[PDB]
């Protein structure tokens, strides 16, 4: 009698995805994880893993699972990888060099794009320095590039750090919005709880 099957339905396909600059992090724990359905699903455009091969994900057993979700431009999915330099990787979501886990993404043009242009998705263009891996920035202080104390009074050479995505159906595949979910596994000095469903 297998019990406590871990849902994943409230995480993989919800009705509201967060912006990339405020990526939502939901802890997964005390779960009987089943990644077979995720692998056998044919709706994911990209599903490739580091450290752990997708075939045997049901065997190794982990203490905790962290899932992060956000929505990014179609072409910018290549920047979500260890040791990659880009714009969103350097300013929004930075991955460690020795990252363990993988990312799952699929096209979401049928929901995240509007005829008049969906303007509810943001991505940061400016900040002082590159952020260390696994960090979230939310403050909206104006990135100054002029001499004076900007004081946040929007104008010339006090540039707004945050700009919006113009998601519209008429653009190409490289510009279509994509929903990205990254699963991160770790091991630490604690008993392992979140792992596969065995078999019988």
């Amino acid at each position, epitope marked *: 009698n297998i019990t406590n099957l871990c849902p994943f339905g409230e995480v993989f396909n919800a009705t509201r995805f967060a912006s990339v600059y405020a990526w939502n992090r939901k802890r997964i724990s005390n779960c009987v994880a089943d990644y077979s359905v995720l692998y056998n699903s044919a709706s994911f455009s990209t599903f490739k893993c580091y450290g752990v091969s997708p075939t045997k994900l049901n065997d190794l057993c982990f203490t905790n699972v962290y899932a992060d979700s956000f929505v990014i431009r179609g072409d*910018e999915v290549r920047q979500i990888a260890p040791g990659q330099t880009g714009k969103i990787a350097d300013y929004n979501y930075k991955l460690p060099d020795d990252f363990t886990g993988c990312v799952i993404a699929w096209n979401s043009n049928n929901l995240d794009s509007k005829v008049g242009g969906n303007y509810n998705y943001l991505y940061r263009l400016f900040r002082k320095s590159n952020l260390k891996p696994f960090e979230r920035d939310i403050s909206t202080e104006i990135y100054q590039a002029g001499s004076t104390p900007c004081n946040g009074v929007e104008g010339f050479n006090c540039y707004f750090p945050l700009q919006s995505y113009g998601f519209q159906p*008429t*653009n*190409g595949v490289g*510009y*279509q919005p994509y929903r990205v979910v990254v699963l991160s596994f770790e091991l630490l000095h604690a008993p392992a709880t979140v792992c596969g469903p065995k078999k019988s």
Partner: antibody
Amino acid sequence: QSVEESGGRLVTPGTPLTLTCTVSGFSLSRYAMSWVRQAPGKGLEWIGIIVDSGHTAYASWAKGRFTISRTSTTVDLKMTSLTTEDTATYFCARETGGGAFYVFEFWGPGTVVTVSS
Amino acid sequence: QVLTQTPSSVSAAVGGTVTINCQASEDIYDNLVWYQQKPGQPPKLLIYDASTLAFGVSSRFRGSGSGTHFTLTMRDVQCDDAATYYCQGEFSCSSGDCTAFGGGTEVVVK
């Protein structure tokens, strides 16, 4: 996959004219057709595009005097209030595959629309 | 939103090579294509994504570049390459006007 169009005529300024581009050898509802034009001896210009779903986009320099309509096998375009600088050659272009817009790998033979008195 | 091609015209011998540069006013990732238009004929797609050769084209045409600077160079240009070339790339949407074409360059072989 063969794409052809016709409708070139000599018209006075301010008179509407219709060009119809007819598809052949594929399903229209899967690929996006677009219209481009070039003046005699000058560079290419972009006019507009219609995606497979039915949504349409245009060009700013056109200012919004064109209209692309879709149907079974007639990706037609209609203009209004033509000027004397619209004498050019028009093409209708097909795409490569699903998505990957603005590739324009199949082209029609080309038709010439001239405006004069 | 603005595409620029330099030089406008360039000539080389049959056993020679020439370069074509097409710069974009905005970051466009790698979404850029090239065309070849012989006089009186519809343009033919040569390279898409700025580094992938189209089907049925020769391997003496190569492309490169990413971001805002791109370059196309033909090696050992024959007498069949005498035509005009254009560069086209996407440019977001609302911000600008989807797609624009470059001014084009003319190539003549002696």
